[PDB]
C-alpha cells in the first residue's frame, strides 16, 4: 500500500510488459504454433506479473484479485461476461448487413487449421493476458483509486499493448478506442468480486476475440469494420457504466 | 454477495440474447428452399425424331476425345444421352439444364455479396447487377457467374477500365472481345456503346445478354438452348454436346455455395412421353 511500490509496480509491470512484447516479436517459432493460434507476444504481461509478485512485497496484496474459486457472483459475473460480448456481435451484424457487405463465417472459408485449436488458441490467449492485466493490474491500481479511474488507467496500458498500427494512424485511432473500451467493460465485470476475477476477464477476452474472428474475419484491416466495431464496442461500454452506476 | 435470482434473470438473458445471435447466422448454416415454378410444354416431336434431325442433318456436334486436345464427331448414341431430358429431371445438378435463365428470381442481396468476397470491383456494384438482372429479365446467378467467368485473369482488367485517349470504358461481361486480343477488342465495343461508367457496363451487357441469347422464348433454358427442341437441329447455340451439362454445373454450385436453389424451371416435354402425362394429372387430381 506504499505510494513508493505502487507507483514502482505500475511502472516495472509496464516497462518490462511492453519490452517482452518486442523481444518475443522474433521468438514466433519457439512454442510449435502459428499467429493465428497463439500470439506469444500475448505472454508479455503473464511474465510481466509474475516478476512483479515476487520482485515486491505484501504478497496477499499481490495475489487478492487472483482468485481461483468458483463463487456465486462470479457465476453471475460470467453469464455477463457472454451477453456483452455476443450484443457486439449483434451490433455489429447489423452494421455490416445495412452499410456494408455482409459477413461470412470462419467455418465457410476453406481454413487449413481445425476451428477447435483456434478456440482453445484464443482462450489461451485471453487467459494469460487478463492474469496480468485484470487479475493483477487491476486490483494494483485498485489500491489507490475506485474502479472507474482504475479501468481507465488499465485501459490505457493495454491499448498501448493492443496497440495497431499496421493500417494507418486513423485504423489505429479506433482500434484504441475498441481496446479502451474493452477494458472498461471488463473493469466493472470484476468489481467486487472479492478477487474471483480470472474466470470473468478470460470468459469476455476469449468470447471477444473468437467473436470477431468467427464472424468478422473476412474484414480485417478494413477502416469502416474497425469503427462500428469501436462504436459498438464503446456504445455498450457507456451503457453497462451506466447502469451499473445508478443502480449503484 | 453471491445471488441465485440474479442467475437466473441472467441465464434468461443468455437464452434470449444467443437466440437473436443465432438468428442472425441462420442465413449461412441452414439450407434455403424455394417454391418451384416449373413450366411444362408438350412437343409434337418425339425423342427418337429429335435424336434423328441432331443425327444427320447439321451433324455439328461436337466431343472432346480421351486426348482432351482435338474434337471429333459424336456418337448416335452419344447424341441420344446428351439430349434425353428424362434422364436430368432427377439429378441435382443438372436440373439446371431446365432452369429459365430469363427469369429474375430475387435472391436474397446478401447471400450474392458473399460469393463476390474475392472480387472486390464485381462486390462494388453487387446492386447494378441485380438492377440490371431484373430490368433486362436476366437470372441473376446466370447473369452474375457470366460476369465472373467472363472477367478472368486478363478479363478483369477490362473490367476495371481500359485507358482509351481520355477516357475509360469497362466491361463486365467479356463481350465484344475477340480471343485475338481481349482487352483491345473489348475495350473497343465498350467505346462504341458509350460505356464510360460501369453501370453503363452493367446494364447494357445485361441488356444484350438478354436481346442476344435469351430473345426466344422457346430458347430461354440451357437445353433449349443446346438442342432446340421445338425445332431441333436448327438455331443451337453450341456444337459440344456436353455444353448444357457443364453450364448447368457451373449453375448448379453456384446455388449450392448460396445455401439455395432454382426457383423458375421450364422443361419440355418430348411427344412420346406426353401420352402417359395428361392422363395420369387428370388421375391424380380428380377423386370422383
Ligand atoms: C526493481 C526496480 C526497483 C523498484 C522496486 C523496489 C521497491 O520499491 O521494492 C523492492 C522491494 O523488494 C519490495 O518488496
Same mark, same amino acid.
Given at each position: 500500500?506504499?505510494?513508493?511500490?505502487?507507483?514502482?509496480?505500475?511502472?516495472?509491470?509496464?516497462?518490462?510488459?511492453?519490452?517482452?512484447?518486442?523481444?518475443?516479436?522474433?521468438?514466433? *517459432? =519457439?512454442?510449435?504454433?502459428?499467429?493465428?493460434?497463439?500470439?506469444?507476444?500475448?505472454?508479455? /504481461? %503473464? +511474465?510481466?506479473? !509474475? $516478476?512483479?509478485?515476487?520482485?515486491?512485497?505484501?504478497?496477499?496484496?499481490?495475489?487478492?484479485?487472483?482468485?481461483? *474459486? =468458483?463463487?456465486?457472483?462470479?457465476?453471475?459475473?460470467?453469464?455477463?461476461?457472454?451477453?456483452? /460480448? %455476443? +450484443?457486439?456481435? !449483434? $451490433?455489429?451484424?447489423?452494421?455490416?448487413?445495412?452499410?456494408?457487405?455482409?459477413?461470412?463465417?470462419?467455418?465457410?472459408?476453406?481454413?487449413?487449421?481445425?476451428?477447435?485449436?483456434?478456440?482453445?488458441?484464443?482462450?489461451?490467449?485471453?487467459?494469460?493476458?487478463?492474469?496480468?492485466?485484470?487479475?493483477?493490474?487491476?486490483?494494483?491500481?485498485?489500491?489507490?483509486?475506485?474502479?472507474?479511474?482504475?479501468?481507465?488507467?488499465?485501459?490505457?496500458?493495454?491499448?498501448?499493448?493492443?496497440?495497431?498500427?499496421?493500417?494507418?494512424?486513423?485504423?489505429?485511432?479506433?482500434?484504441?478506442?475498441?481496446?479502451?473500451?474493452?477494458?472498461?467493460?471488463?473493469?466493472?465485470?470484476?468489481?467486487?468480486?472479492?478477487?474471483?476475477?480470472?474466470?470473468?476477464?478470460?470468459?469476455?477476452?476469449?468470447?471477444?476475440?473468437?467473436?470477431?474472428?468467427?464472424?468478422?474475419?473476412?474484414?480485417?484491416?478494413?477502416?469502416?469494420?474497425?469503427?462500428?466495431?469501436?462504436?459498438?464496442?464503446?456504445?455498450?461500454?457507456?451503457?453497462?457504466?451506466?447502469?451499473?452506476?445508478?443502480?449503484? | 454477495?453471491?445471488?441465485?435470482?440474479?442467475?437466473?434473470?441472467?441465464?434468461?438473458?443468455?437464452?434470449?440474447?444467443?437466440?437473436?445471435?443465432?438468428?442472425?447466422?441462420?442465413?449461412?448454416?441452414?439450407?434455403?428452399?424455394?417454391?418451384?415454378?416449373?413450366?411444362?410444354?408438350?412437343?409434337?416431336?418425339?425423342?427418337?425424331?429429335?435424336a434423328?434431325?441432331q443425327?444427320?442433318?447439321?451433324?455439328?456436334q461436337?466431343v472432346?476425345?480421351?486426348?482432351?486436345?482435338?474434337?471429333?464427331?459424336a456418337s448416335?448414341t452419344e447424341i441420344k444421352s446428351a439430349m434425353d431430358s428424362?434422364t436430368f429431371?432427377?439429378?441435382?445438378?443438372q436440373?439446371?439444364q431446365?432452369?429459365?435463365?430469363?427469369?429474375?428470381?430475387?435472391?436474397?442481396?446478401?447471400?450474392?455479396?458473399?460469393?463476390?468476397?474475392?472480387?472486390?470491383?464485381?462486390?462494388?456494384?453487387?446492386?447494378?447487377?441485380?438492377?440490371?438482372?431484373?430490368?433486362?429479365?436476366?437470372?441473376?446467378?446466370?447473369?452474375?457467374?457470366?460476369?465472373?467467368?467472363?472477367?478472368?485473369?486478363?478479363?478483369?482488367?477490362?473490367?476495371?477500365?481500359?485507358?482509351?485517349?481520355?477516357?475509360?470504358?469497362?466491361?463486365?461481361?467479356?463481350?465484344?472481345?475477340?480471343?485475338?486480343?481481349?482487352?483491345?477488342?473489348?475495350?473497343?465495343?465498350?467505346?462504341?456503346?458509350?460505356?464510360?461508367?460501369?453501370?453503363?457496363?452493367?446494364?447494357?451487357?445485361?441488356?444484350?445478354?438478354?436481346?442476344?441469347?435469351?430473345?426466344?422464348?422457346?430458347?430461354?433454358?440451357?437445353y433449349?438452348?443446346r438442342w432446340?427442341?421445338?425445332?431441333?437441329?436448327?438455331?443451337?447455340?453450341?456444337?459440344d454436346i456436353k455444353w448444357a451439362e457443364s453450364?448447368?454445373?457451373?449453375?448448379?454450385?453456384?446455388?449450392?455455395?448460396?445455401?439455395?436453389?432454382?426457383?423458375?424451371?421450364?422443361?419440355?416435354?418430348?411427344?412420346?412421353?406426353?401420352?402417359?402425362?395428361?392422363?395420369?394429372?387428370?388421375?391424380?387430381?380428380?377423386?370422383?
Amino acid at each position: 500500500i506504499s505510494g513508493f511500490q505502487w507507483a514502482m509496480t505500475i511502472f516495472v509491470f509496464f516497462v518490462i510488459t511492453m519490452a517482452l512484447s518486442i523481444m518475443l516479436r522474433d521468438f514466433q *517459432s =519457439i512454442i510449435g504454433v502459428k499467429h493465428f493460434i497463439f500470439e506469444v507476444t500475448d505472454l508479455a /504481461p %503473464l +511474465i510481466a506479473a !509474475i $516478476i512483479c509478485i515476487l520482485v515486491f512485497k505484501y504478497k496477499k496484496v499481490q495475489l487478492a484479485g487472483l482468485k481461483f *474459486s =468458483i463463487s456465486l457472483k462470479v457465476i453471475e459475473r460470467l453469464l455477463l461476461a457472454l451477453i456483452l /460480448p %455476443l +450484443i457486439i456481435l !449483434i $451490433i455489429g451484424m447489423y452494421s455490416f448487413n445495412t452499410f456494408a457487405d455482409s459477413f461470412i463465417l470462419l467455418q465457410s472459408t476453406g481454413l487449413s487449421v481445425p476451428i477447435t485449436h483456434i478456440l482453445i488458441g484464443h482462450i489461451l490467449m485471453a487467459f494469460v493476458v487478463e492474469f496480468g492485466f485484470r487479475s493483477y493490474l487491476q486490483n494494483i491500481v485498485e489500491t489507490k483509486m475506485n474502479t472507474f479511474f482504475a479501468s481507465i488507467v488499465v485501459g490505457l496500458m493495454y491499448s498501448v499493448f493492443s496497440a495497431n498500427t499496421t493500417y494507418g494512424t486513423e485504423f489505429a485511432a479506433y482500434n484504441f478506442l475498441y481496446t479502451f473500451s474493452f477494458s472498461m467493460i471488463l473493469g466493472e465485470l470484476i468489481r467486487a468480486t472479492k478477487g474471483r476475477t480470472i474466470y470473468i476477464a478470460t470468459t469476455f477476452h476469449a468470447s471477444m476475440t473468437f467473436g470477431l474472428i468467427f464472424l468478422f474475419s473476412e474484414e480485417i484491416g478494413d477502416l469502416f469494420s474497425i469503427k462500428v466495431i469501436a462504436i459498438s464496442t464503446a456504445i455498450v461500454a457507456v451503457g453497462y457504466i451506466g447502469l451499473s452506476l445508478i443502480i449503484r | 454477495k453471491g445471488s441465485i435470482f440474479g442467475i437466473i434473470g441472467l441465464v434468461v438473458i443468455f437464452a434470449v440474447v444467443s437466440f437473436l445471435f443465432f438468428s442472425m447466422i441462420s442465413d449461412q448454416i441452414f439450407f434455403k428452399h424455394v417454391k418451384s415454378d416449373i413450366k411444362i410444354e408438350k412437343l409434337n416431336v418425339t425423342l427418337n425424331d429429335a435424336a434423328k434431325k441432331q443425327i444427320n442433318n447439321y451433324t455439328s456436334q461436337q466431343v472432346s476425345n480421351k486426348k482432351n486436345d482435338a474434337w471429333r464427331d459424336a456418337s448416335a448414341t452419344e447424341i441420344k444421352s446428351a439430349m434425353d431430358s428424362g434422364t436430368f429431371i432427377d439429378n441435382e445438378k443438372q436440373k439446371y439444364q431446365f432452369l429459365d435463365l430469363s427469369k429474375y428470381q430475387g435472391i436474397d442481396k446478401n447471400r450474392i455479396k458473399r460469393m463476390l468476397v474475392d472480387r472486390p470491383t464485381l462486390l462494388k456494384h453487387t446492386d447494378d447487377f441485380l438492377k440490371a438482372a431484373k430490368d433486362k429479365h436476366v437470372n441473376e446467378v446466370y447473369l452474375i457467374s457470366h460476369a465472373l467467368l467472363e472477367t478472368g485473369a486478363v478479363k478483369s482488367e477490362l473490367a476495371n477500365g481500359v485507358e482509351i485517349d481520355g477516357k475509360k470504358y469497362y466491361n463486365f461481361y467479356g463481350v465484344g472481345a475477340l480471343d485475338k486480343d481481349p482487352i483491345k477488342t473489348g475495350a473497343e465495343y465498350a467505346k462504341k456503346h458509350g460505356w464510360d461508367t460501369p453501370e453503363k457496363a452493367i446494364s447494357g451487357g445485361a441488356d444484350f445478354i438478354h436481346k442476344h441469347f435469351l430473345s426466344s422464348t422457346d430458347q430461354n433454358t440451357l437445353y433449349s438452348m443446346r438442342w432446340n427442341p421445338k425445332n431441333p437441329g436448327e438455331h443451337q447455340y453450341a456444337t459440344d454436346i456436353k455444353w448444357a451439362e457443364s453450364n448447368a454445373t457451373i449453375i448448379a454450385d453456384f446455388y449450392k455455395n448460396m445455401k439455395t436453389e432454382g426457383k423458375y424451371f421450364k422443361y419440355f416435354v418430348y411427344k412420346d412421353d406426353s401420352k402417359h402425362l395428361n392422363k395420369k394429372l387428370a388421375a391424380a387430381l380428380e377423386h370422383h
